Amino acid sequence: QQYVNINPPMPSDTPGKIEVLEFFAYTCPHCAAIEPMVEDWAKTAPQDVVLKQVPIAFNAGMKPLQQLYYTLQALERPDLHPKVFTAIHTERKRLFDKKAMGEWAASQGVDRAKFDSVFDSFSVQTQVQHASQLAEAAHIDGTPAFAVGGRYMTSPVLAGNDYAGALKVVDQLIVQSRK
């Protein structure tokens, strides 16, 4: 009813843990709205569950925003991740290409040369490719969306058009994923 099956199931990337993938995009207003609720949910999630946030690209212009996510993670600035949403949606900053992104990161204390180097790195390119591979295998059709255990997919729309309802379904799917 409030979720769909992923067939064939996706293989697990975290032994002994149930993976929850939140597929998101920085440009998605609902991803921005749900982000603090996801961060709060992650604080109380079961210890055998791991949350991964996976940036997606439905058109090629979204690929720099995938690179931005993995660049901030590689620079060990996860504090800047929620601030990207705020900068784009509340402060109306146009953080849509590498140049604007690097200027914004530099204003946040990131060395510009390191940002630019990491943004172009093979490691980031591989993570972006993997993010799009995961979205393809999970049969993504919008954001925000949640894949649970590599086997089930839900979203606020599927869970009765409600953010908290989506996370309640995620909780139900976690129990199901343990069998």
Residue numbers in the entry: 1 to 179
Text from the published report:
B. pertussis' single DsbA (BperDsbA) (Heras et al., 2009) and DsbC (BperDsbC) enzymes have been shown to be essential for both the formation and stabilization of the pertussis toxin (PTX), a major virulence factor in B. pertussis infection (Scanlon et al., 2019; Stenson & Weiss, 2002).
The structure of BperDsbA was solved to a resolution of 1.65 Å using molecular replacement and refined to R‐factor and R‐free values of 16.87% and 20.16%, respectively. BperDsbA shares the canonical DsbA‐like architecture (Martin et al., 1993) with a TRX‐like core fold defined by the conserved motifs β₂α₁β₃ (residues 19–63) and β₄β₅α₇ (residues 130–179) separated by an alpha helical insertion domain. This insertion includes a three‐helix bundle (α₂, α₃, α₄; residues 64–111) and two additional helices (α₅ and α₆; residues 112–129). The active site includes conserved catalytic residues, with the CXXC motif (C28P29H30C31) located at the tip of α₁ (Quan et al., 2007) and the proline loop (G142T143P144) bridging α6 and β4 (inset) (Ren et al., 2009). Although the protein was oxidized prior to crystallization, the structure revealed BperDsbA in a reduced form, likely due to radiation damage. BperDsbA also exhibits notable structural differences compared to class Ia DsbAs such as EcDsbA, including a restructured β5–α7 loop that produces a narrower peptide‐binding groove more consistent with class Ib DsbAs (McMahon et al., 2014; Santos‐Martin et al., 2021) and distinct surface electrostatics.
